[PDB]
Design a binder for this molecule. Structure first.
Ligand SMILES: NC(=O)C1=CN([C@@H]2O[C@H](COP(=O)(O)OP(=O)(O)OC[C@H]3O[C@@H](n4cnc5c(N)ncnc54)[C@H](OP(=O)(O)O)[C@@H]3O)[C@@H](O)[C@H]2O)C=CC1
Ligand code: SF4
Ligand code: SF4
Ligand code: FES
Ligand SMILES: [Zn+2]
Lengths: 73, 71, 693, 92, 328, 103, 178, 111
């Protein structure tokens, strides 16, 4: 009731709730893929690092990759 | 893997390469298979006809699924 | 009514070669007369008329085939659409390339080709650059009626170069002809009949032949694709530069297809005078070198033994100080085999004004005769070898070194039945080689007319005698060359209109070096010498340089010279710079910079000129055009780019001779051909091509 | 014909040109002189270089990398040889 | 360093800096130099996330990464200096705050960043920024602390450059912007000590250009305490003469003897006493800034000046003071 | 304005016209953008003359017409407060390059 | 077409088309005179300058091609008078005939650089104020020369430095066989 | 016409190469030949360190290839000389249509 925001509605229901479909999330839950299915993430935008998303060079991302195509000697 | 270590930094969810190398190869009858995709020929990849003359499983390039002759 | 018809020039600016202006056959291509020489197929009689007839298996360099019927133009009075590729133009023939029968024939065939063909276009490496896709999207029908089980074919293992997906392959037979004829190895085959036709080696047999990576450009379909360029890029991303190549001294033309800062794919490009449309597998797959083990920061040696990536000011300062505190005659300027003309000119002008004359290219051994330019050129053009009647490859193993010279030799052995003689070490040749002898003794046997092949060399109208610069290393180089020129004068080889005497080289810089007079006077240089200045030379024997020599390796990769180098100076590669190169036939190409230099590297000539100004010697020029003017001063041959400058001086000026050594037969100059230079040695593709032997 | 070239100069570069109307005296000079010159100086880099239109010059590298340029724009064979003699003399 | 670019704003300079005092008047010019010559900047901020917002621009998409850190808590300073090779230190205060004392904000931090950078072996250049004339036995406790900071950053970490900028002028500065908005007390300017002070201000852009110039330099400028003085050795009264040229006002100065000022700044010096209320940051009358104002030691001696950075400062008339036009 | 430059003479005449215009307009330039203290009228005249002389080797009349038009555009956008002022104040060997880049 | 019979032959000088909209590729000198015709004429009444499309052909000698469209609200027809003027050829302006040509010609000069004769207020309309260079040419790179603008210590000001961005990726889709 | 063109000064001392792009060796089709293109070398392309993509700094990065293609070396040279570039025209290497026929595959090797 506090700290709510949009995008907390999982994908099983985000269809039924925007009127795109007529399948309640209790019906699309038999269609979510078991092998690669992932739970929702609430869009942690700004709520601290390691919750926010980071590219692979941001220097905040653990494991900042180097893009230099040439492999130095 | 190493290729999959370039785009995935999670390293806790199984790498797609393993997710496809752990699915068993699909037995079939003839010498050519379809592998239209998942099940629906319109929600899968362009149909890729695979040859099963060899003994080892012949992977479908688009989906990674593997087919064997099953004689 | 005073119309303005289009010019109707040939299809690609194709020079039409009349054998004589009398036999010009006049045929009508869509009611527009064109004069084609006698013997032109209808397809060529249309390519003279600007009409581009869709062809799948007809390659101009390769033989003519009917393995598919994509051309099928309708000539006037034939009952069926004639395949344009094989129908010879008869005088008066009326070719209608766009009549409804021709277009229906083209649509018919492009439906058959796309019938058993798999939908691999998204996963096909040649998806954008595809003859099948671009002929279906231009001449083939918009829809396909075949809704059944396409045939599929397993993927043959053709080595670590050609990734093979024979299901895509349309069995046009172009590659099985290329390997039999141009590559001359005869490994590929059209096994089976019917739709079950499968192209490839019947037994698992890696395409051991070099020059067999060009089958991918030969292939009109993705099937045969570069395995090194596995999927890394697409036909549209690649920005193309019309660079040249520096691996081997043939100086083959090239397109460095780069995506951003790295070289994704190195593909050939038409240059009929050096490499028609083919490049050696040393050049196609050396691009992987340019991104591995690159030197990117100037590292000097600390007080321990490991390097320290100092800036350019500090490295140039230390090198300048150490040349100031050394005797002048102890400076040597070994220049790498990949160095361009400019940086070799700057190296010469630097180590000269420093009071030394010990600059020389990496490959040229002691006492080379770089005075007369015929003495280190392929006087007969690399195209000229097509008119040769008999070849005498003196050592030279041209399949290994200068692979496109051997491609021309094989093409001109197949087309005109020339016979070659081989006096060298036992080697494997694409064509019939007729090995004569192993050592120089059989060279005397020919010089004295006492050989069963001297009678051949005499009678031949246009003979050629290729003498590889790999035998300049031998101590009796003057004796060998004197016997060579004796064979020339005896068999009328070098005559005013043929000049069949030609020496090929194995290092790209070697021709430009010997042109700028970069001659190693003798030994006692590189020994008792204390400022060895390797300019990208890795094949220089670092066991010769004295332990106290302050080697300064201005390379770009470093294999063994870098470990000895008391200070490194990272230079640019051959794609990152713009260097004027000279191939063996004297043609003077000029690379065009494709990718940015890696790290803090600089141009070869920039590094040498900056080292000059840091080390006090004021050197006149300060730009690339300035040093090209200096080249015009020292050797104007290397300024008239893209123009071969023949040497107008025969061997009748070489003073005299000596005795040739009986022992020490001709030695294999290039052992690998897959690790001949630094770019090729640090590559991840050339290494692992060792399995291809 | 000079003999003392290998001990005075460092190299001699003759920029004759292949088939120009001019620079033909330079070609005649080389054709008639180079055999004997090199047989007399078996190690000097007497550089002969061709072109398409470059004026026929005769360069010369002395000890410390200096360079005299003698233009054989119209000099005949003995004139060219006298120019080379002056070049050899101006280095020793 | 490992520079792969042409100019900046998308180039790389191998300088992944952590400008500790970036969310400050000197910091915004230094961060803009470091991130307009194309180099990463790990701006660490102390409190409100709105502090370094004006620094998310002036750097191209991660060239400026504002990070949160507590000044007294390490293992967070080590996290800010995790991926870094340059560490500039602009953390300094001219006024004692009830929570952070003069040493705990000028000396006991610079020493702490010095130590936690020493530990994080890899900080190639560590610049330490302290006021000019910050030598021990200086009256202002801010300068004694800033001198101890230099002595502890050089000891605990040698080859660490030390800029000594004198009072820096520029937009949003602490030297001219308090005088204006006090000229808004009807032209009444209270130049303290009678303007006998001799101090050499400097356009903050040029202090930043020097702080970056000791980064782009070679191995030199390491352990060498520069003195970023500037041109035109001024006096407080004379500098005020130039303000009134920009802001259209009539010079109406007054002289204040130092006892009168130190008595007028006797309040706001009970900072450690008035616990349940923070005081409003003494702008013009600062007992410590006044102790510094007394002795005119704020002049560049024979120590290293801008000349030893191939750099010449801008003047203090014209544009380098044209931020005053917004007061007309 | 029609290109009466059927010859270099008319073009040069209108070059001098534009030069007189810019010179006689320098007062408003110095006023609107406040350069009467940083720059001297001699220096602004110097800069305008160095502009008109930097592009003096134009044997083409129409190119001179177009150059004068670009100059009149620049002036008219400087006279009025169309462009700012921090550019007007700005509008008014091999080794040292080698050390920086490769180009 | 009636318009070609009455029109003086010299005015339709170079070209004339007969589909996809008819055009009279005329000469720059006879242009505003040709635009005077087709308007204020009883059987050809256009009155409406729809558009003035600068078109840049770099491989021509007269680079640009100022394509004047023209609608004829009376006879319900549309004619496209064209011209050809290179970078330094002032072309006649038709703002006097169709006053809508004012802004269209300002845009043609701004984008391309085809200055217009006796056009009052011929001033860059679209591009930035201090813009140097003409964008819709061919040789003008897409990303512009100096057209990045960022804020800086020169507060309240956005500078105009040299430009640097993710490189525009030009894709060579064009296939052989046309 | 270089100065009136608004191009900055530093990009009119550029050295270009007026080539004609050779045929893509992979596909045997001449439908992209005869389109002469100025080639502003534009080699300087680093890798923007945040993401994996590249990042040019030269304005003339793409326009050499994209949208600036003439139809003849004379027009391309006239263009690169108006704007004052230092063009070095690299001639296109064209193929010899050597006479060839089918009946040459079945040649008789005498005996
Ligand atoms: N201003 C001047 O005229 C002069 C200043 N200097 C020196 O220049 C440097 C920067 O100057 P300037 O930016 O104007 O100074 P400020 O007083 O505006 O402070 C600048 C930065 O210091 C940080 N800071 C100060 N004290 C602390 C603390 N206790 N804990 C954490 N962060 C702190 C601020 O964080 P936050 O913003 O969150 O408070 C801000 O990021 C300082 O060393 C200063 O003494 C040199 C010459 C004179
Ligand atoms: S060759 Fe490849 S890209 Fe071309 S049509 Fe066949 S599958 Fe598609
Ligand atoms: S593999 Fe390629 S070249 Fe060979 S027949 Fe098949 S399509 Fe033709
Ligand atoms: S290519 Fe000529 S018909 Fe097959
Ligand atoms: Zn599949």
């Amino acid at each position: 009731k506090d700290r709510y925001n949009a995008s907390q509605v999982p994908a099983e229901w985000h269809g039924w709730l925007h009127f795109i479909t007529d399948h309640t999330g209790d019906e699309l839950l038999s269609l979510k893929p078991k092998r690669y299915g992932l739970e929702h993430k609430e869009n942690f935008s700004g709520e601290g690092d390691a919750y926010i998303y980071h590219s692979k060079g941001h220097t905040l991302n653990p494991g900042q990759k180097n893009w230099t195509r040439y492999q130095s000697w | 893997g190493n290729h999959t270590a370039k785009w995935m930094q999670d390293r806790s969810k199984k790498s797609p390469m393993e997710l496809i190398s752990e699915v068993p190869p699909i037995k079939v009858d003839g010498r050519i298979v379809a592998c239209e995709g998942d099940t629906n020929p319109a929600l899968g990849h362009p149909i890729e006809f695979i040859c099963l003359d060899l003994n080892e499983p012949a992977i479908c390039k688009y989906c990674g699924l593997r087919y064997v002759q099953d004689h | 009514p005073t119309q303005i018809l289009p010019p109707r020039n040939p299809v690609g600016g194709a020079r039409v070669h009349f054998s004589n202006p009398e036999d010009a056959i006049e045929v009508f291509v869509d009611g527009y007369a064109v004069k084609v020489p006698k013997g032109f197929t209808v397809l060529q009689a249309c390519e003279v008329a600007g009409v581009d007839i869709p062809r799948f298996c007809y390659h101009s360099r390769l033989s003519i085939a009917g393995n598919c019927r994509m051309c099928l133009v309708e000539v006037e009075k034939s009952p069926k659409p004639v395949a344009s590729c094989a129908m010879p133009a008869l005088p008066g023939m009326k070719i209608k390339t766009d009549t409804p029968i021709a277009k229906k024939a083209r649509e018919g065939v492009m439906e058959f080709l796309l019938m058993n063909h798999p939908l691999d276009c998204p996963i096909c490496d040649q998806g954008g650059e595809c003859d099948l896709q671009d002929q279906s999207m231009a001449f083939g029908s918009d829809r396909g009626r075949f809704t059944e089980m396409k045939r599929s074919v397993v993927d043959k293992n053709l080595g670590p170069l050609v990734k093979t997906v024979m299901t895509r392959c349309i069995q046009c037979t172009r590659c099985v002809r290329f390997a039999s004829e141009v590559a001359g190895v005869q490994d590929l085959g059209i096994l089976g009949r019917g739709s079950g036709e499968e192209i490839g080696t019947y037994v698992e047999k890696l395409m051991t032949s070099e020059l067999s990576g060009n089958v991918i450009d030969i292939c009109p379909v993705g099937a045969l694709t570069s395995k090194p360029f596995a999927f890394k890029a697409r036909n549209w991303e690649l920005k193309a530069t019309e660079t040249i190549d520096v691996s081997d001294a043939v100086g083959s033309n090239i397109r460095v297809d780069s995506r951003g800062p790295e070289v994704m794919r190195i593909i050939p490009r038409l240059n009929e005078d050096i490499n028609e449309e083919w490049i050696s597998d040393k050049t196609r797959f050396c691009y992987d070198g340019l991104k591995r083990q690159r030197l990117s920061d100037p590292m000097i040696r600390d007080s321990d033994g490991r390097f320290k990536a100092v800036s350019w000011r500090d490295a140039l300062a230390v090198v300048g100080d150490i040349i100031h505190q050394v005797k002048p005659d102890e400076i040597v300027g070994v220049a790498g085999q990949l160095s361009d003309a400019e940086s070799m000119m700057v190296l010469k002008d630097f180590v000269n004004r420093m009071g030394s004359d010990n600059v020389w290219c990496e490959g040229t051994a002691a006492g080379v005769d770089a005075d007369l330019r015929y003495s280190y050129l392929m006087n007969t053009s690399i195209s000229g070898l097509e008119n040769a009647d008999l070849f005498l490859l003196i050592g030279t193993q041209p399949r290994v070194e200068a692979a496109m010279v051997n491609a021309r030799i094989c093409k001109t052995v197949r087309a005109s039945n020339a016979k070659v003689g081989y006096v060298g070490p036992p080697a494997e040749f694409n064509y019939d080689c007729k090995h004569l002898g192993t050592g120089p003794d059989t060279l005397k046997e020919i010089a004295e007319g006492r050989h069963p092949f001297c009678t051949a060399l005499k009678n031949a109208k246009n003979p050629a005698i290729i003498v590889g610069a790999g035998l300049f290393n031998r101590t009796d180089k003057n004796a060998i060359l004197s016997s060579v020129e004796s064979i020339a004068q005896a068999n009328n080889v070098v005559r005013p209109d043929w000049n069949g005497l030609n020496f090929l080289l194995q290092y790209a810089a070697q021709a430009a070096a010997l042109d700028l007079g970069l001659i190693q006077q003798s030994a006692k240089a590189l020994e008792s010498a204390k400022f060895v200045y390797l300019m990208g030379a890795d094949d220089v024997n670092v066991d010769k340089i004295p332990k106290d020599a302050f080697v300064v390796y201005q390379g770009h990769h470093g294999d063994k010279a870098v470990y000895r180098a008391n200070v490194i100076l990272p230079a640019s590669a051959f794609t990152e710079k713009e260097g004027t190169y000279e191939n063996t036939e004297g043609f003077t190409q000029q690379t065009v910079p494709a990718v940015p230099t890696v790290g803090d590297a600089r141009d070869d000539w920039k590094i040498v000129r900056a080292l000059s100004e840091v080390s006090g010697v004021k050197l006149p020029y300060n730009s690339i055009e300035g040093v090209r003017s200096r080249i015009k001063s020292v050797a104007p041959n290397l300024v008239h780019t893209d123009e071969r400058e023949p040497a107008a001086f025969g061997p009748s000026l070489k003073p005299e001779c000596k005795e040739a050594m009986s022992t020490t037969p001709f030695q294999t100059v290039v052992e690998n051909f897959y690790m001949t230079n630094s770019i090729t040695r640090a590559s991840k593709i050339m290494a692992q091509c060792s399995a291809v032997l | 014909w000079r003999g003392s070239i290998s001990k005075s100069m460092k190299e001699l570069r003759i920029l004759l040109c292949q088939s120009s109307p001019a620079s033909a005296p330079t070609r005649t000079f080389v054709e008639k002189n180079y055999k004997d010159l090199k047989s007399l100086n078996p190690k000097l880099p007497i550089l002969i270089r061709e072109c398409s239109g470059v004026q026929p010059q005769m360069w010369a590298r002395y000890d410390m990398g200096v360079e005299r340029c003698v233009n054989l724009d119209g000099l005949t064979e003995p004139q060219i040889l006298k120019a080379l003699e002056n070049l050899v003399k101006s280095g020793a | 360093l490992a520079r792969k670019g042409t100019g900046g704003r998308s180039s790389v300079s191998g300088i992944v800096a952590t400008v500790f005092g970036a969310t400050g008047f000197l910091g915004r010019y230094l961060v803009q130099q470091l991130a307009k010559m194309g180099s990463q900047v790990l701006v660490p901020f102390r409190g409100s996330e709105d502090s370094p917002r004006h620094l998310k621009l002036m750097g191209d998409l991660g060239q400026v990464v504002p990070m949160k850190f507590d000044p007294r808590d390490e293992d967070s300073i080590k996290a800010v200096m995790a991926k870094a090779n340059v560490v500039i230190n602009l953390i300094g205060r001219e006024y004692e705050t009830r929570n952070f004392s003069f040493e705990d904000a000028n000396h006991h931090i610079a020493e702490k960043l010095a130590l936690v950078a020493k530990e994080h072996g890899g900080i190639m250049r560590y610049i330490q920024v302290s006021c000019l004339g910050a030598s021990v036995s200086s009256p202002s406790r801010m300068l004694r602390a800033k001198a101890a900071a230099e002595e502890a950053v050089l000891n605990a970490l040698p080859e660490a450059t030390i800029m000594r900028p004198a009072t820096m002028i520029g937009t949003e500065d602490r030297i001219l912007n308090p005088w204006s908005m006090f000229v808004k007390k009807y032209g009444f300017l209270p130049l303290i000590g009678g303007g006998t002070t001799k101090f050499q201000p400097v356009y903050v852009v040029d202090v930043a250009a020097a702080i970056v110039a000791a980064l782009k330099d070679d191995g030199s400028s390491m352990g060498k305490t520069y003195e970023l003085g500037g041109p035109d050795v001024f006096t407080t009264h004379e500098l005020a003469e130039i303000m009134y040229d920009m802001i259209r006002e009539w010079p109406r100065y007054v002289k204040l003897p130092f006892p009168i000022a130190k008595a007028m700044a006797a309040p706001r010096d009970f900072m450690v006493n008035k616990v349940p209320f923070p005081l409003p940051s003494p702008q013009i009358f600062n007992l410590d800034q006044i102790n510094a104002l007394t002795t005119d030691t704020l002049v560049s001696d024979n120590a290293l000046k801008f000349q030893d950075l191939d750099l010449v400062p801008h003047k203090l008339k014209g544009y380098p003071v044209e931020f005053l036009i917004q007061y007309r | 304005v029609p290109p009466n430059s059927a010859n270099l003479t008319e073009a040069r005449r209108r070059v001098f016209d534009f030069f007189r215009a810019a010179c006689r307009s320098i007062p408003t330039i110095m006023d609107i953008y406040n350069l009467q203290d940083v720059v001297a009228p001699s220096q602004l005249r110097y800069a305008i003359s160095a502009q008109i002389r930097n592009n003096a080797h134009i044997t083409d009349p129409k190119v001179i017409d177009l150059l004068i038009f670009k100059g009149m555009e620049e002036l008219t956008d400087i006279v009025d407060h169309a462009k700012q002022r921090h550019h007007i104040i700005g509008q008014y060997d091999f080794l040292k390059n080698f050390y920086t880049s490769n180009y | 077409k009636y318009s070609w019979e009455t029109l003086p032959k010299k005015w339709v000088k170079k070209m004339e088309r007969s589909e996809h909209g008819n055009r009279f590729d005329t000469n720059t000198d006879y242009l505003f005179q040709l635009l005077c015709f087709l308007k204020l004429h009883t059987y050809t009444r256009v009155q409406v300058l729809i558009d003035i499309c600068g078109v840049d052909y770099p491989s021509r000698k007269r680079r640009f091609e100022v394509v004047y469209n023209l609608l004829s609200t009376r006879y319900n027809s549309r004619i496209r008078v064209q011209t050809s003027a290179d970078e330094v050829t002032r072309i006649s302006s038709v703002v006097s005939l169709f006053p809508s040509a004012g802004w269209w010609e300002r845009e043609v000069w701004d984008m391309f650089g085809v200055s217009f004769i006796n056009h009052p207020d011929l001033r860059r309309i679209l591009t930035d104020y201090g813009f140097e260079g003409h964008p819709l040419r061919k040789d003008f790179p897409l990303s512009g020369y100096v057209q990045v603008r960022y804020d800086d210590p020169e507060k309240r000001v956005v500078s105009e430095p040299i430009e640097m961005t993710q490189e525009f990726r030009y894709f060579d889709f064009a296939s052989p066989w046309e | 016409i270089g100065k009136v063109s608004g191009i900055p000064e530093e990009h009119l001392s550029r050295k270009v190469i007026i080539y004609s792009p050779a045929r893509t060796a992979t596909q045997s089709g001449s439908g992209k030949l005869g389109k002469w293109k100025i080639n502003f070398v534009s080699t300087l392309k680093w890798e923007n360190p945040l993401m994996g993509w590249t990042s040019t700094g030269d304005p003339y990065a793409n326009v050499g290839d994209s949208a600036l293609a003439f139809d003849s070396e004379e027009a391309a040279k006239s263009f690169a000389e108006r704007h004052g570039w230092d063009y070095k025209v690299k001639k296109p290497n064209t193929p010899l249509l050597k006479v060839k026929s089918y009946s040459d595959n079945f040649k008789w090797k005498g005996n």
